[PDB]
Ligand binder design. Structure first.
Ligand code: 7BR
Ligand code: CL
Ligand code: NA
Length: 370
């Protein structure tokens, strides 16, 4: 089970696609809800995501059908299409998923933030870094629900530098576009969701705390954080979860004025990647880094909760550290950082010492020597 949020608010979830095209925005929204008696949210909601994950793993497409069978009915503890909790303006996180992932696979993070009173927009990227995604060829197709699928692109070694950088720039643009869509919905523009879901977007009107915007992401999503910050000053801080720095151009490093927080796993990181992170540091800029002891790259994504302890450790979905323990540390430290740099008046400053890695399961900075 993906854990429930630790915060006081109940949590809702819905999908938004606008426009309907491959250049439109597609995101999963997690938000504070009133109602707690709705059906839980289907975790991986289409069979084509399993086909996607199979290609991503480099296995026979039929392995996809087996993944579906195992995980296809699994839910995540968010009330599907619940009404938004009214009467308060919520800060906004835009969340960027990793390579081979998609929008639904960071619900532990998204649910927890929402339970503390954030609205989380987990984008689905159309850069072919997602295992799968979908969109509609034109208006007719969107009405009848005729989905077109776009699958992960496998690169040759000689495309890697160029293409990963093209993708990270597109990802940043998709983050910025998602932000503008949400802010517009906040500013009351009618938007016809391309998905026919029973969630009236008009509830979102005047529900966003417009200047309290942050961007968060895992791995490829962590680079996306950094690109996004250096492209859109509307984002006031970033949190990179085990950032994979390779996609970034040499230009961006000196070009990130906003506070930035690296939350790393113990076993993923390596000198080349750490050196690139330290290239973001300048005396005039706010930068924090912590390393979660006994953790692996996958501790930040939902599949760390989807299998048993033994199978999970074997597949490097789980580390030596308990997955709930690990994600609690990442989430609580994130909340403290956000409160600090968005100027929130909540109680997240109780976790301030975790930003400093002052905990028996944290390492201040990094374990990697460079
Ligand atoms: C570093 C990396 C990728 C970059 C990235 O973003 N990574 C996270 C993927 O996280 C995922 C992927 C699918 C999932 F289903 C879930 C879930 N839950 C999480 C790992 C590219 C370079 S490499 O090939 O040498 C080694 C791997
Ligand atoms: Cl290295
Ligand atoms: Na911009």
């Amino acid at each position: 089970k993906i854990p429930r949020g630790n915060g006081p608010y109940s949590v809702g979830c819905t999908d938004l696609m606008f426009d309907h095209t491959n250049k439109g925005t597609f995101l999963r929204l997690y938000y504070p809800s009133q109602d707690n008696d709705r059906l839980d949210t289907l975790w991986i909601p289409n069979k084509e995501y399993f086909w996607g994950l199979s290609k991503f793993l480099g296995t026979h497409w039929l392995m996809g059908n087996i993944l579906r069978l195992l995980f296809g009915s699994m839910t995540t503890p968010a009330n599907w299409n619940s009404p938004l909790r009214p009467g308060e303006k919520y800060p906004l996180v835009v969340f960027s998923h990793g390579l081979g992932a998609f929008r639904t696979l960071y619900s532990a993070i998204g649910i927890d933030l929402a339970s503390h009173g954030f609205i989380v927009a987990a984008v689905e990227h159309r850069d072919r870094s997602a295992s799968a995604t979908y969109y509609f060829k034109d208006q007719s197709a969107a009405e009848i629900g005729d989905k077109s699928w776009l699958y992960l692109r496998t690169l040759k070694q000689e495309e890697e530098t160029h293409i990963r950088n093209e993708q990270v720039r597109q990802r940043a643009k998709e983050c910025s576009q998602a932000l503008s869509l949400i802010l517009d919905i906040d500013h009351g523009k009618p938007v016809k969701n391309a998905l026919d879901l029973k969630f009236d977007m008009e509830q979102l009107k005047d529900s966003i705390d417009r200047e309290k915007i942050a961007v968060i992401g895992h791995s490829f999503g962590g680079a996306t954080v950094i690109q996004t910050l250096s492209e859109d000053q509307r984002f006031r801080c970033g949190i990179a979860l085990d950032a994979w720095m390779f996609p970034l151009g040499d230009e961006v490093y000196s070009r990130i004025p906003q506070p930035l927080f690296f939350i790393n796993s113990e076993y993923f990181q390596y000198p080349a990647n750490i050196i690139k992170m330290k290239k973001c540091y300048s005396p005039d800029k706010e930068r924090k880094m912590i390393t979660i002891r006994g953790s692996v790259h996958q501790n930040f994504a939902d599949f760390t909760f989807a299998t048993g302890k033994i199978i999970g450790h074997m597949l490097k979905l789980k580390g030596d550290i308990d997955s709930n323990v690990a994600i609690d540390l990442s989430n609580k430290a994130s909340l403290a950082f956000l409160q600090k740099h968005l100027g929130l008046h909540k109680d997240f400053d109780q976790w301030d010492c975790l930003i400093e890695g002052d905990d028996e399961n944290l390492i201040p900075g990094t374990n990697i020597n460079t």
